[PDB]
């Protein structure tokens, strides 16, 4: 599924991410703008030979399992292909782990990047939330 913007932001505040950690539902949605374009189907092969899926583009390296990524973890306690359901709350519950783990959202390169430190309310504007 890609989702429409103001979609997201309802799926995502519905799931308690707003405000989650202190980020605004705003850096949220511009997170996920830059990771995924919205699309839940979106995956990314990392030099190491990981694997990036969903959403949130979350890691197999850590977070996930794939079956392909040898010597790495599942925080999340999920296959990696459960971040590619049309439904987000696995991903949603998997990104409130990450978030939570000390660097907050800079564990996302393209937040860092093109999110933090910009105007990111703009991503909820016209909204009705
Ligand atoms: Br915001
Ligand atoms: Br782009
Ligand atoms: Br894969
Ligand atoms: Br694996
Ligand atoms: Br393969
Ligand atoms: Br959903
Ligand atoms: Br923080
Ligand atoms: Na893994």
């Known amino acids: 599924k890609v ?4 979609e997201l932001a309802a799926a995502m505040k519905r799931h308690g991410l707003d405000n989650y950690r202190g980020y605004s539902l705003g850096n949220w949605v511009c997170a ?3 990771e995924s374009n919205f699309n839940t189907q979106a995956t990314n092969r990392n030099t190491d030979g990981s694997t990036d899926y969903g959403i949130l583009q979350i890691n197999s390296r ?7 990524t ?3 973890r599942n925080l999340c306690n999920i296959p990696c292909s459960a971040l590619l359901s049309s439904d987000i709350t696995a991903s949603v519950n998997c990104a409130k782990k990450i978030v939570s783990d000390g660097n907050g959202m ?7 990047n093109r999110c933090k430190g910009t105007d990111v309310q703009a991503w909820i504007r016209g909204c009705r939330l």
Do not use: L, T, Y
């Not at 989702?3 to 103001?6: A, I, L, N, P, V």
């Not at 850590?62 to 392909?68: E, Q």
């Open 3 to 6: 989702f429409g913007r103001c």
């Open 32 to 34: 996920a703008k830059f």
């Open 62 to 68: 850590w977070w996930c399992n794939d079956g392909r």
């Open 70 to 72: 040898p010597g790495s």
């Open 106 to 112: 800079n564990a996302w390169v393209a937040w860092r």
